[PDB]
Symmetry: C3
């Protein structure tokens, strides 16, 4: 499935100095999100900092959501992940996408302006309606 | 996609003192899960505790799963996340939903009865059948 | 949805000494991935190690991805999770699946050859095309 998603550029560097998120290849699942910062931010081991992206999206379709994930190299090699682990973006959220960057490792890390700091996937989601029962059907 | 899901209330406070999970808005991707506790649990930095929800679900449809995620504010601001990071709920699981709460930060945290401690999304899943090959087709 | 996925066995122990990933039940969302190692690896608290699986997959379909997640018991009980938290596998990735194993807890852990160290789910993904707008439609 392909989907057009409205995006608002909140910082005029986004799409210029800080490239807009793109899929690296036709078979890529995620887009990389970049740090929209004026200056580098040093992130000490154990600390968390909130990094703006300079953009907002409006998924709009309640059958879709986005999930923000760490980048594999940053996470594995540098211990730079998300403070909320996975960031869930609701279809009706229209605010700036913000990235909770957490240093889970032992080495201080410099977050540079424009650095790819997270990735984002769009996944279908199902809205559950709970049906209260006394007993389930037989299943395991 | 909308789906009705059977749920069993295991603790009679759930749906009363501890509200049943709901979608906050029509465009929300996730439902918040609450701590079904008799008394507050203090969670020291670095520690993990298993928190009951007082409910069980039976997704039943093998094309669907649920994923439990940290809440964004708890994770980012308080360092309160999941000890298994993401909790995968199988379609044929009928046990109580349990939340592994892990304090990944530096500040002790009081988990209160009724506190929203995680969120849960329902996502379609695909069951893979592996086809063993010597070589892949050309792709990157 | 069911999907056949091409897999290449890179280490001849995979499918023999190290069982190929399987769904435990018909309603299971994920498959367990095993450590393809010659000898046990001791993982001290706070440390990360890259563990091979001895296999490669080629999802091929750009409407599908895989996500690697911690196992619930390892994560909750032993503090053994993923260093990148969640591992996203692109449809056009044809390399060996590698698992970033991170000890987020306080107890040293022995990763044994053949140990189930992660699980993997296949989820539909949507490739977003951004549509730049000045203002969103009314939504929350
Ligand atoms: O890592 C994150 C997680 C969430 N959000 C945005 C998208 C969500 O729809 C919105 C509301 O989050 P909650 O307050 O409901 O958790 O915050 C982010 O920008 N980054
Ligand atoms: O955070 C979690 C993760 C899993 N489970 C339940 C749902 C799963 O289907 C079931 C089996 O998990 P495993 O033992 O297969 O990991 O445990 C939870 O209640 N909470
Ligand atoms: O935990 C992980 C995460 C990723 N990959 C593989 C699959 C991805 O498609 C590929 C490229 O990852 P990036 O360099 O784009 O993050 O690495 C793994 O083997 N394990």
């Amino acid at each position: 499935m392909m989907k057009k998603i409205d995006v608002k550029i909140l910082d005029p560097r986004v799409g210029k100095e800080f490239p807009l998120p793109t899929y690296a290849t036709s078979g890529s699942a995620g887009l990389d999100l970049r740090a929209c910062l004026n200056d580098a931010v040093e992130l000490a081991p154990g600390d968390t900092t909130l990094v703006p992206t300079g953009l907002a999206i409006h998924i709009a379709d309640p059958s879709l959501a986005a999930m923000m994930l760490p980048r594999s190299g940053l996470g594995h090699k540098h211990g730079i992940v998300l403070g909320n682990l996975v960031g869930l973006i609701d279809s009706d959220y229209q605010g700036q996408l913000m990235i909770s960057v957490w240093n889970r490792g032992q080495d201080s890390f410099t977050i540079q302006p424009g650095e790819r700091i997270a990735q984002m996937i769009f996944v279908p989601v199902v809205q559950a309606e709970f049906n209260l029962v006394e007993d389930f059907d037989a299943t395991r």
